[PDB]
Amino acid sequence: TTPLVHVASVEKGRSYEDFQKVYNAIALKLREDDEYDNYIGYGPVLVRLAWHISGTWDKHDNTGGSYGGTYRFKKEFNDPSNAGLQNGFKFLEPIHKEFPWISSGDLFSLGGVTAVQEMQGPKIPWRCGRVDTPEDTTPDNGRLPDADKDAGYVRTFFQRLNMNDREVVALMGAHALGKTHLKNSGYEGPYGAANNVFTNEFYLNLLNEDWKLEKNDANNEQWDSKSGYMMLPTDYSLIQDPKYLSIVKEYANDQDKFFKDFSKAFEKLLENGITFPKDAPSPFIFKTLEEQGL
Amino acid sequence: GSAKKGATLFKTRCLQCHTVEKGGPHKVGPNLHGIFGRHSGQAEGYSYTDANIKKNVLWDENNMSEYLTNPKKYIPGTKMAFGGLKKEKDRNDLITYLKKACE
Ligand code: HEC
Ligand code: HEC
Numbered sequence: 175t176t177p178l179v180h181v182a183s184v185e186k187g188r189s190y191e192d193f194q195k196v197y198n199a200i201a202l203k204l205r206e207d208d209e210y211d212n213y214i215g216y217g218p219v220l221v222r223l224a225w226h227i228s229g230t231w232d233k234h235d236n237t238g239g240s241y242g243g244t245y246r247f248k249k250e251f252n253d254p255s256n257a258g259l260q261n262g263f264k265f266l267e268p269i270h271k272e273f274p275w276i277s278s279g280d281l282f283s284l285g286g287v288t289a290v291q292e293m294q295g296p297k298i299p300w301r302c303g304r305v306d307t308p309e310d311t312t313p314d315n316g317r318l319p320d321a322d323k324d325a326g327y328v329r330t331f332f333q334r335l336n337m338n339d340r341e342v343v344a345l346m347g348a349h350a351l352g353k354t355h356l357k358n359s360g361y362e363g364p365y366g367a368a369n370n371v372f373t374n375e376f377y378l379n380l381l382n383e384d385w386k387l388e389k390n391d392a393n394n395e396q397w398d399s400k401s402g403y404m405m406l407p408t409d410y411s412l413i414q415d416p417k418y419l420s421i422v423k424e425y426a427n428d429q430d431k432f433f434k435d436f437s438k439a440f441e442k443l444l445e446n447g448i449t450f451p452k453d454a455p456s457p458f459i460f461k462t463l464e465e466q467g468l
Numbered sequence: 469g470s471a472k473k474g475a476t477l478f479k480t481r482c483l484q485c486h487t488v489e490k491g492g493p494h495k496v497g498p499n500l501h502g503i504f505g506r507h508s509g510q511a512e513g514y515s516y517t518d519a520n521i522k523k524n525v526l527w528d529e530n531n532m533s534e535y536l537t538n539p540k541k542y543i544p545g546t547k548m549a550f551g552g553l554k555k556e557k558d559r560n561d562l563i564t565y566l567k568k569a570c571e
Contacts (some may be wrong), residue, residue: 208555294540367485367496368485373549464538
């Protein structure tokens with residue numbers, strides 16, 4: 175068999191500040207075009223893009239993962255569940271031609287950490303060494319979770335990503351960002367009041383706001399709030415399960431542990447499928463534009 | 469500058485939280501009717517933080533721009549979740565759109 179072993183090979187001669195200039199470039203354009211998606215920005219879509227490439231990973235055969243950076247291909251670009259992420263791709267490409275040395279896998283995975291931190295989120299350690307790979311490394315279609323299911327499907331699916339209850343709930347906190355659109359997913363409405371700001375709001379409006387199951391214009395069934403908030407049945411299934419409920423209520427009154435656990439889980443998510451050597455440098459903590467005086 | 473483009477800015481960036489025109493909504497942020505800088509907060513009984521009342525600040529359009537630029541750096545410990553308005557022109561578009569509805 176010889177299970178797939180993806181070794182982390184650092185780019186030629188590149189180091190911390192070399193990737194920091196990529197961070198700053200992404201963080202700049204993130205601040206440049208703020209008129210994308212009704213003044214939400216490219217923040218959320220860059221996070222979702224980072225999770226979609228890391229969600230194709232299968233722990234059994236070590237297939238897929240963010241290591242590949244195979245998003246440049248045709249087969250995985252036109253996926254029905256991947257729609258809306260073309261914008262995030264065309265966001266990073268003009269940045270990909272000014273640093274031709276950097277690989278796509280590192281660029282996409284650097285976009286998501288960059289997005290979170292610039293959106294006033296937690297510091298997320300990032301590692302390099304994801305090298306581009308031929309067209310036979312591309313994962314098939316349908317490895318991403320379905321929007322219409324229950325908590326049993328959630329816990330089962332994330333086992334393939336090697337995630338426990340705490341990590342699942344924490345990673346699901348990223349759904350306090352942005353919104354949903356019918357033109358790709360088939361669901362409508364903002365997740366929370368603050369779209370581009372990273373907060374524990376996801377857990378707060380879940381345990382407070384009144385949620386009623388209704389029908390959208392796509393005939394799909396979603397949960398709506400009197401305040402205008404929305405949630406997917408699988409996001410809502412977190413309070414339909416006892417194990418997931420205690421963690422949600424923990425992240426509600428405590429924001430710092432959520433920031434702490436998300437940074438752990440999200441980093442673990444992006445590094446899945448990568449075998450790091452013993453001489454590989456310690457994880458990078460990049461400086462935000464606010465810390466640089468901008 | 470342009471108060472009509474501040475209408476669009478307020479709709480997407482604010483309206484989901486605040487409201488200028490009525491006095492009863494109190495969604496996430498408090499009502500913005502009549503803000504020339506009363507002082508820190510206005511009371512329907514809207515639960516405030518401990519940060520706002522501290523160091524009373526008149527909301528004059530020059531310091532308002534600072535608060536809209538970086539809400540966290542201007543008032544540390546604020547409950548308001550807003551990234552900020554980094555551009556200068558869009559500020560001068562939104563801040564004018566306010567006080568005519570504050571009549
Ligand atoms: C939630 C998602 C918000 C968004 C987006 C914006 N604001 Fe806000 N605002 C919000 C809260 C929860 C609070 C109260 C903070 C506290 O410590 O209690 C505020 C407060 C303000 C204020 C000051 C009012 C006061 O101190 O009494 C101003 C001047 C204000 N907000 C303006 C403002 C503008 C212009 C925004 C977008 C263009 C905006 N806020 C976004 C919640 C949220
Ligand atoms: C770590 C990040 C992350 C995880 C895990 C995650 N999401 Fe998302 N998802 C996002 C972000 C960010 C958005 C906002 C997209 C936007 O604003 O354009 C989003 C939006 C969506 C959308 C709508 C996208 C659109 O353009 O309409 C669907 C559907 C969705 N999520 C389903 C799921 C499901 C189902 C799961 C798990 C079972 C899940 N998400 C877990 C980050 C995540």
